[PDB]
Amino acid sequence: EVFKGHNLPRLRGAMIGPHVTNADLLEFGNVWKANHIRWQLIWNGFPHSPADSATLDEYRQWLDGALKRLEAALPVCREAGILVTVDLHTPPGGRNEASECRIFHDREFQKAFIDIWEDIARRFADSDVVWGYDLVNEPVEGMVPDGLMNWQRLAEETARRVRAIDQKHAIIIEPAPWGSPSSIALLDPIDVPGVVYSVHMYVPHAFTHQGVYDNPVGIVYPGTIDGKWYDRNTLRKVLEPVRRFQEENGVHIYIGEFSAIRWAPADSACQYLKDCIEIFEEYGWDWAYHAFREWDGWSVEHGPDRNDRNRTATPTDRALLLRSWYAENVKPQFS
Secondary structure (H helix, E strand, O other), X not given: OOOOOOOOOOOEEEEEXXXXXXXXXXXXXXXXXXXXXXXXXXXXXXXXXXXXXXXXXXXXXXXXXXXXXXXXXXXXXXXXXXXXXXXXXXXXXXXXXXXXXXXXXXXXXXXXXXXXXXXXXXXXXXXXXXXXXEOOOXXXXXXXXXXXXXXXXXXXHHHHHHHHHOOOOEEEEOOOOOOOHHHHHHXXXXXXXXXXXXXXXOOOHHHHOOOOOOOOOOOOOOEEEOOXXXXXXXXXXXXXXXXXXXXXXXXXXXXXXXXXXXXXXOOHHHHHHHHHHHHHHHHOOEEEEEEEOOOXXXXXXXXXXXXXXXXOOOOOHHHXXXXXXXXXXXXXXXX
8 A cells, every 4th residue: 555656565775886898787677686777867976076067958958968878778777677766966057065966956957957957857757767857956055045945845846746747667865964864853744645665774974984974994883983883773763763754654754775884893884784684674765776787885795894996806895785686576577
């Protein structure tokens, strides 16, 4: 009775990078047994991008090329037995210095967001490979000027417009700010059919992003982190608002991203991923691991040493964990 927008027991897969090859996709679906990818429409980087200073014309040209490749990859995903999340990872206008989206600050970019989503929905309305439309990656509002919509309202309006065009696909809404688990309590369920809610799981940052940016390394999990005990029970507490939202509203949950950096000490990253997945599975949440063949920091084909960028000779524990879960997947059946 709860809307998922697919007829499988569960979607389990990964984020891919924008330069993913057809061979990569076929391997991931047919050999790794993933039944799902999140396709990031990303302009170089996140949270900072050339989009941040690009004109709307420049942005639309970039996005046109990104969509062209997505469109060409869908037949490959069909052959690989993969359903696709279309993620607008870099929205029109990009973000200011504080990583706040211009779609909340500028009338032109706010209007463009809606217009662009109408075009994407029109393009993919009939696709049986597309599962859902993740309207914007990790929205961050900052101050919203009088006369512009905040995320609650913009998500509602954009979802209405997409649903007018597309009678089949899930509309995937992440809470603001940051698509964080804690942010889901700030979102009211939107009054549009066929909506799925999504968060990203990287809590605690000090652990999952150790040795990224200027975060120190050597942070063990389980263990004391940010002065607090972290284990599977702590992760359950982090995700409790999401579980509450799911149960109280009778809605489906999708984890669009989760990870731990590969060079976390010992088996820390593997245990974090295991604990995350176990919780997601208990609650019946679909999920995408971040990421398959993207930045090697998040790669399960790369090893424990931050200074070694080479693939490992033999499977990592993280790769074996993911494949043990993908082995439970049912493949989509296409006409």
